[model samples]
Target: HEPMRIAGRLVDTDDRVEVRYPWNDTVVGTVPAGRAEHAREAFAIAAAYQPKLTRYERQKILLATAEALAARKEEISDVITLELGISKADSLYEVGRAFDVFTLAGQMCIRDDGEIFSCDLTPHGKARKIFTMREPLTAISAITPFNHPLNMVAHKVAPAIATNNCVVVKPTELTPMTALLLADILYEAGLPPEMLSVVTGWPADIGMEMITNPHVDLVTFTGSVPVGKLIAANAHYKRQVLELGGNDPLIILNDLSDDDLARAADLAVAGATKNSGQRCTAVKRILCQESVADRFVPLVLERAKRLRFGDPMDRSTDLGTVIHEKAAALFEERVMRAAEEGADILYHPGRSGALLPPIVVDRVPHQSDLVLEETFGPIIPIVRVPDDDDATITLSNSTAFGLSSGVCTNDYRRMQKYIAGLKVGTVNIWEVPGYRIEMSPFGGIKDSGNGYKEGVIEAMKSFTNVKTFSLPW
Candidate 1:
């Protein structure tokens, strides 16, 4: 059993929530079923903390945590794979990326840049210079998702630490083990006890309190669209950073060689199957130019069929289970519905408990559910488009989501057009749409997010308040 880390102390309770392995329903561990009072206590404790860590102190702590985490990457990676059911390779990659998040957050700790303004430019202004400095928010409430469990928590908590703010994190109930592991690392790295808390419980018991509490100055969430909208409605007057859902598309232009087209096909399979396609940036739609569909479809099918799905603990498993049986069934149902709506299910889909083999659907209409909504599983929907600038961009932007996109084309002019035309926060050329560095700005524009970015630097900016002052020179 695992204890909830509330106000930096382990609180063990008899009322605990079981953490089960999604693939087999085996009880992996248990965490405290904390109540609303626990969340309130956490918020109160965090709100009273007057952080006084120097920039050097913050950087040193973050750097130490990164080093310690790296030493235990294999162990933590196993934990992630056991709970989340992603392949071992993907779990290790998440650990590596999480370490980078810590390292980058350490680097961002000392980057407290502020602007200087000459007030004497206007006649009403006195002979003084204005200077700005950022102050950390008193308290933050972070709610993370299960897809990228460790890294998502790292992204939110690391930035709060960089800015010297206290944060109460409510990690996903399905995969809370790694998040708790991260909490221990942070505390061991010399972070003040009041600076971080990990509350474990059902969303009904603690989620709303985490958002609507008076003590939490900012709420940062990475989850779905419906929950994000609900949080936005309940978190009145509080600073919010909601990174929601996406139905990102990958457009394969007709300007590629056979080799390049094959490479694009490979990327399509990778983007669609990575993390078991649980990522918000996962390629939900594959838009191919009609001229190249015949070539690309077969290549994609060959790659898709080659994917091996089974135990996540095995190193050779290319794809693993979804979060649970219900989610896997949802993927199964959606693919069947698409087939009913005239889309061809090119690959056979099988479900064994929570395991759903990677599926590929062709001739998906623009209005089909498989193409219109965020599938959130290893299901690829292919749509054909005319070889023109307008049709490609229009169909890519058909969904309500505008998160990220990839356009594979050898023509620089076509790439430029897609970059300027796609209505997404990020556009990648000749790469997966989900590719991003730990420190780079990342967020969506439409239903995906509200234009607020989440990165080491951008999140630090959001977690702090810039105060301007003037003094006579």
Candidate 2:
């Protein structure tokens, strides 16, 4: 049980919300059910706070924070597993990548990213030099979802901290513990407590207030498309970087041949089921060429069945329960509806509470909600594409979401086609759709997002403003 961190103080309230383990339904912790008033106060205090850390100071704090995060790797990893109901492997990866978030921010902050341009190069320009520098945003509202839990928070907070920006964060009420842990660590690692606050509550209460607060200079959010739209609509005049939903595809081209087909199946199933297939970049639709569709389905089913689903804390559990049984019910309902709509249910071990087995549905209808929308669960649906047709590229782009895609092909020409044709943020060749480094640019276009990116380097760019300066040569 802990108090919410709001504007440099530990504030406790009578309305305490229980933070429970989603898989087993045990109360792991409790936090204040924050209100709109609390969010308003945090934002106001953040707006008034001025961070004066020099380049070296900022670097030192970030580096120290990264080391501290590494020190408690298992402890924090357990919290993530407890709160988010993800496997230890998933939580471990989430916590491990967070180290890079801080390290990238620390190292990047020390390097001078200013630009110099000579006015003498142009005939119409004066004899002077023009320069540009990056400065932090005044105040920002950062909202995180429970999918990545901790790493998502790092993606938002570390960059803002590196740029010396004040941020008010509203972690998802489902997984507030790890987000609060990071805020506590940063303060211990020398961040000004007033510059960062972690508030927890429902979206109607504190979440909306953080976005629409007048004092906030920008809103950076990662969650559902509906909420992303709400932030875009309500956070008027505030700079926005919204990383929303994705129905990304993994297209298995027929060019894989016999030798590579097995490997392609491995890639497809992994993309569909890893982290229980909850990622925005998870393979929502596996577009297999008609020639290889029959061969691919069985391979994927064998792999999907091999995945063990149980308590996330169990060392042998390959696939853990999703956020809750209600979420599990949605998966159950969607698969049943999908079956009713003519999709073949190849393999399903059935569901026990939130522990729903990864179901492989083949010949899935293209327009059905199972593949049309982000299912956010462990159901793998395979869509067959005619061998003579270019349906893979067409179907991959047909969805409103285009965050990322994977292409399994041996031919370079076809790879180039996907690279040029698919309207996605990143295209991975013979790899999982979700693959990316911590520092690389990552985002999407159209309904997925507004094309604003969110990795360490990209996020640092979004968290700051470029001011141009001129002086006599």
Candidate 3:
């Protein structure tokens, strides 16, 4: 068993947990089985840190780490593929995205600006100037998920550094290597050791400590809704930034020509299959116009049949297994339940261990589990909608999630109407729901998040508190 990092030191104990490959049960590695005591110690160290770095120093550190990460891109990608079972191409893409996160954080470090105000406007008041500056929270707790292992961790860590906050990160036990590797890069790039720590263990062991610890001034989490709710309940007064799950929709308008229909079909398959359809922003429902479903469904199926779905190490493999065997089981069970609910399964799901083939289920009712729930797998549930804007908007807003939506239409006016009517954080015209850059503001409304965003700039805002002072002019 390897050691869990605390206060920038490797802490190993007799208790250890094995990390296995998700596709096969092969033991990839082992990590220390950490407990609440370790978390307390880390929090104590972070909370007690004094004399935070200057903005210029923070920018330097992030930029250096970005360069170093880019130099070792292949190694990072390899680690992600080994533990997470993401396809080699997708793993590489994830690493590149992580690099972009660092670059954006570096840019944000020196760009934090607040407002200026005139405090006196009355005849009885004297002239005074009020200016605000941001200060970092003393301690922050970060909980990340398995999907986008490196990028998600970056989303938490990079912001903490940009704002000069001391952070303790609890990465997913199933995919801790990538997070650890990133921590090492930051350390090598001259980050203060006391500012960051990576604790590797099961949530049941240390999750409460990360959430309920009084010293933690803020908590940032990216995961499922149930866990987010639990954190909200336990966090008490600590500030929270919870980015929960999403049931994203991709709508295809009836105005599409045959060429546009084929392109939209390609986007439908890619949006649902990228990262093996594990992304929170992946298109969960395909809202196709009744006039195009017959033509669109066949094209999507033809493309799905051509995708390779095994051996993530293979460069040509397009898709890999789900996170684990149990995840595959859940996906298979959910699809079977949809079939029983009278949804026409165009292709029966085939599964072996953590690997599940792509599925296309049509005629899914709006209330069916397959359409309403956040189906986190490589399955496309097509729901027919009328060509009217109201029908599309109703179906898109039917779910509890409001993360992202995409519309495929050549009509500019119709696209703008869909953009205005859809209840989501992001709307893309002629693109997939997952389209975004690291610098753009990203977070959902409703059950997805509390409305606070999580891009480089917005995250810096969330991780800090603004202080205003006035002086007589």
What is the lDDT of every predicted structure here?
A: 0.90, 0.87, 0.88
Order the candidate numbers by lDDT, best to worst: 1, 3, 2
Per-residue lDDT for 251-303 in model 1, tens only? 99987888988999999999999999999999999999999998889999999
Which stretch of 10 consecutive residues in model 2 shows the poorest summed lDDT? 386-395
lDDT by residue (217-296, candidate 2, tens digit) is 88999999998998899988889999999998888888767668788888888888888888999988988899998888
Give the clashing pairs for model 1.
none
TM-score, candidate number 3? 0.97
Query: Per-residue CA lDDT of candidate 3, range 1-473, in tens?
Result: 56777778998768777888887779988887789999898999999985368889998999999988889988888888888998898898898898899998998776848888886778867689888998989899999999988999999999899888999998888888888888888999999988999988888998899998889999999999999999999999999999999999989999998888899989999999899899999988999999888888888888888888889888998988779988888877877887788778887548889887888888777687777888888887788888778978987998899999899999998988988999999998988899999978999998988788988888988898999999989
The list of candidate 2 runs beyond 4 A from truth reads: 121-123
Q: TM-score of every model?
A: 0.98, 0.97, 0.97
**lDDT, residue 139, model 1:** 91
TM-score of 2: 0.97
lDDT of 3 at 43: 93
Model 2 clash number: 0
Best by lDDT: 1
